[PDB]
Amino acid sequence: KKHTIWEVIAGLVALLTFLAFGFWLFKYLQKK
Prior knowledge:
PDB class: membrane protein
Structural class: mainly alpha
Distance between the termini: 43 Å
Number of domains: 1
Number of strands: 0
Order of helices and strands: H
Assembly: monomeric
């Protein structure tokens, strides 16, 4: 169709996770 399940769980979570945590992980660990 378009891909696998990512666009169903990832594109649905990763986008709601990668950023949520990313905005920190880096801005905290990558910025120290």
